[PDB]
Design an enzyme around this catalytic site. Structure first.
Site, PDB file in Angstrom:
ATOM      1  N   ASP A   3      39.330 -22.947 -22.836  1.00  0.00           N
ATOM      2  CA  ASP A   3      39.517 -22.620 -21.413  1.00  0.00           C
ATOM      3  C   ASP A   3      39.117 -21.123 -21.336  1.00  0.00           C
ATOM      4  O   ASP A   3      39.639 -20.300 -22.077  1.00  0.00           O
ATOM      5  CB  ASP A   3      41.031 -22.778 -21.098  1.00  0.00           C
ATOM      6  CG  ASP A   3      41.420 -22.363 -19.666  1.00  0.00           C
ATOM      7  OD1 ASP A   3      40.637 -21.808 -18.928  1.00  0.00           O
ATOM      8  OD2 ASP A   3      42.602 -22.622 -19.258  1.00  0.00           O
ATOM      9  N   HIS A  85      20.880 -13.609 -14.386  1.00  0.00           N
ATOM     10  CA  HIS A  85      20.251 -12.314 -14.158  1.00  0.00           C
ATOM     11  C   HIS A  85      21.326 -11.269 -13.944  1.00  0.00           C
ATOM     12  O   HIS A  85      22.356 -11.491 -13.273  1.00  0.00           O
ATOM     13  CB  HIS A  85      19.220 -12.341 -12.978  1.00  0.00           C
ATOM     14  CG  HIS A  85      19.793 -12.455 -11.587  1.00  0.00           C
ATOM     15  ND1 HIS A  85      19.965 -11.361 -10.747  1.00  0.00           N
ATOM     16  CD2 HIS A  85      20.119 -13.548 -10.851  1.00  0.00           C
ATOM     17  CE1 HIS A  85      20.409 -11.767  -9.568  1.00  0.00           C
ATOM     18  NE2 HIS A  85      20.506 -13.093  -9.603  1.00  0.00           N
ATOM     19  N   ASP A  97      26.305 -11.885  -6.558  1.00  0.00           N
ATOM     20  CA  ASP A  97      24.875 -12.116  -6.948  1.00  0.00           C
ATOM     21  C   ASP A  97      24.409 -10.878  -7.753  1.00  0.00           C
ATOM     22  O   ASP A  97      23.961  -9.891  -7.166  1.00  0.00           O
ATOM     23  CB  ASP A  97      24.007 -12.239  -5.675  1.00  0.00           C
ATOM     24  CG  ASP A  97      22.618 -12.523  -5.989  1.00  0.00           C
ATOM     25  OD1 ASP A  97      22.349 -12.970  -7.124  1.00  0.00           O
ATOM     26  OD2 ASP A  97      21.802 -12.276  -5.089  1.00  0.00           O
ATOM     27  N   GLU A 131      15.180  -9.986 -11.745  1.00  0.00           N
ATOM     28  CA  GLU A 131      15.074 -11.280 -11.070  1.00  0.00           C
ATOM     29  C   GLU A 131      14.826 -11.106  -9.588  1.00  0.00           C
ATOM     30  O   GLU A 131      14.102 -11.926  -9.000  1.00  0.00           O
ATOM     31  CB  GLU A 131      16.391 -12.089 -11.312  1.00  0.00           C
ATOM     32  CG  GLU A 131      16.345 -13.533 -10.786  1.00  0.00           C
ATOM     33  CD  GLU A 131      16.721 -13.704  -9.343  1.00  0.00           C
ATOM     34  OE1 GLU A 131      17.303 -12.781  -8.759  1.00  0.00           O
ATOM     35  OE2 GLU A 131      16.476 -14.804  -8.791  1.00  0.00           O
ATOM     36  N   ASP A 262      36.650 -19.366 -11.747  1.00  0.00           N
ATOM     37  CA  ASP A 262      37.335 -19.913 -12.919  1.00  0.00           C
ATOM     38  C   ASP A 262      36.755 -21.297 -13.247  1.00  0.00           C
ATOM     39  O   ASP A 262      36.395 -21.587 -14.403  1.00  0.00           O
ATOM     40  CB  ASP A 262      38.816 -20.019 -12.575  1.00  0.00           C
ATOM     41  CG  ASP A 262      39.665 -20.428 -13.737  1.00  0.00           C
ATOM     42  OD1 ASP A 262      39.314 -20.204 -14.927  1.00  0.00           O
ATOM     43  OD2 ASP A 262      40.725 -20.999 -13.416  1.00  0.00           O
ATOM     44  N   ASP A 266      34.707 -22.144 -16.730  1.00  0.00           N
ATOM     45  CA  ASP A 266      35.186 -23.160 -17.664  1.00  0.00           C
ATOM     46  C   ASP A 266      34.129 -24.273 -17.851  1.00  0.00           C
ATOM     47  O   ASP A 266      33.998 -24.786 -18.975  1.00  0.00           O
ATOM     48  CB  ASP A 266      36.488 -23.787 -17.143  1.00  0.00           C
ATOM     49  CG  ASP A 266      37.654 -22.834 -17.180  1.00  0.00           C
ATOM     50  OD1 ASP A 266      37.620 -21.806 -17.899  1.00  0.00           O
ATOM     51  OD2 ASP A 266      38.651 -23.161 -16.457  1.00  0.00           O
TER      52      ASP A 266
HETATM   53  C1  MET Z   1      20.509 -19.627  -7.287  1.00  0.00           C
HETATM   54  S1  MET Z   1      19.235 -19.428  -5.911  1.00  0.00           S
HETATM   55  C2  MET Z   1      20.009 -18.156  -4.951  1.00  0.00           C
HETATM   56  C3  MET Z   1      20.096 -16.780  -5.642  1.00  0.00           C
HETATM   57  C4  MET Z   1      18.763 -16.054  -5.886  1.00  0.00           C
HETATM   58  N1  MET Z   1      18.197 -16.401  -7.220  1.00  0.00           N
HETATM   59  C5  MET Z   1      19.018 -14.580  -5.921  1.00  0.00           C
HETATM   60  O1  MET Z   1      19.054 -13.930  -6.962  1.00  0.00           O
HETATM   61  O2  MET Z   1      19.167 -14.025  -4.865  1.00  0.00           O
HETATM   62 CA   LIG Z   2      39.851 -20.968 -17.006  1.00  0.00          CA
HETATM   63 ZN   LIG Z   3      20.978 -14.204  -8.059  1.00  0.00          ZN
HETATM   64 ZN   LIG Z   4      19.818 -12.165  -5.071  1.00  0.00          ZN
END
Ligand code: MET
Ligand SMILES: [Ca+2]
Ligand SMILES: [Zn+2]
Ligand SMILES: [Zn+2]
Length: 277
Positions: A3, A85, A97, A131, A262, A266
């Site tokens: 976990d 990324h 993100d 990315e 979480d 996991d």
């Molecule tokens: C997983 S698709 C949406 C996220 C996109 N790759 C980004 O970095 O903004």
């Molecule tokens: Ca967990």
């Molecule tokens: Zn992303």
């Molecule tokens: Zn992004």
């Protein structure tokens, strides 16, 4: 599989937030916040026993980096990889993100060392740079792997945005075996999943998929609006984006749903243990 402790994943997000604040407010390609993020992740991995490699590339006139970590051992001819990324856009810290995926992959790698796990397949983890400029770092990695090494890849698992504040639970529909492995884990929690459609080929699994490597991954949604049917199955707020702070200055430590982070951390560990055995 173990976990993964949510508190340990959140601790990595707090460090990435402080790194962004100490470096101009972001962790973007070509800015100090990105290399400082790489240095934090590399230090944790080196202390746990991984062999780490920094791969440098140039894009848009600035130096970027991918960080690749190999867990010694396992079959060299069957490699299972997982990645996320590590760069953000320049408008903010990029905590959902993609601090969320970066921290889940990092804690899974640390859990392999803490467990003393000796997988049948060789495990390799990667954090991609640039990315947000068009998958530059993962394209650089695939374009520089000799064909003999490409053929040793058994699968690539991608984690990009896995802690959205008004989450959905989306599973990529690429390789069938990887997809089933994730769906079975969520079935055991009685959490429904849907096929990923919002991002399509817009993350780091695309370069691998294009050269025939089996891929899969998890996503919790970005700018699309959650429907009433989706709020019925997962909670949250219908009519609001999955992530109201996508690519914004408000993608900070408060832009994370702990339950989704979480569950997806996991699930990442469950897939890595299952597919490497
Ligand atoms: C997983 S698709 C949406 C996220 C996109 N790759 C980004 O970095 O903004
Ligand atoms: Ca967990
Ligand atoms: Zn992303
Ligand atoms: Zn992004």
């Amino acid at each position: 599989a173990p976990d993964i402790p949510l508190a340990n994943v959140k601790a990595h997000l707090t460090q990435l937030s402080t790194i962004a604040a100490n470096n101009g407010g972001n962790r973007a390609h070509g800015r100090p916040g990105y290399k400082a993020s790489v240095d934090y992740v590399k230090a944790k991995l080196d202390a746990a026993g991984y062999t780490t490699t920094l791969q440098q590339f140039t894009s848009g006139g600035a130096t970027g980096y991918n960080l690749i970590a190999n867990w010694p051992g396992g079959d060299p001819n069957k490699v299972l990889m997982a990645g996320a990324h590590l760069d953000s856009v320049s408008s903010g810290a990029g905590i959902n993100d993609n601090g969320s995926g970066s921290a889940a992959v990092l804690e899974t790698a640390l859990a392999v060392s803490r467990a003393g796990y000796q997988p049948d397949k060789h495990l390799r983890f990667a954090w991609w740079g640039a990315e947000e400029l068009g998958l530059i770092g993962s394209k650089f990695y695939v374009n520089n792997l000799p064909s003999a090494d490409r053929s040793k890849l058994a699968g690539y698992l991608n984690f990009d945005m896995i802690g959205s504040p008004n989450p959905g639970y989306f599973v990529y529909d690429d390789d069938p075996v990887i997809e089933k492995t994730f769906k079975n884990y969520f079935a055991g929690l009685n959490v429904p999943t849907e096929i990923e459609t919002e991002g399509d080929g817009r993350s780091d699994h695309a370069p691998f998929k294009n050269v025939g490597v089996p891929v899969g991954g998890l996503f919790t949604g970005a700018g699309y609006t959650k429907s009433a049917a989706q709020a019925q199955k997962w909670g949250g707020t219908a009519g609001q984006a999955f992530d109201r702070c996508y690519h914004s200055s408000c993608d900070s430590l408060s832009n994370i749903n702990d339950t989704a982070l979480d569950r997806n951390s996991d699930a990442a560990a469950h897939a890595i243990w299952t597919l490497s055995s």
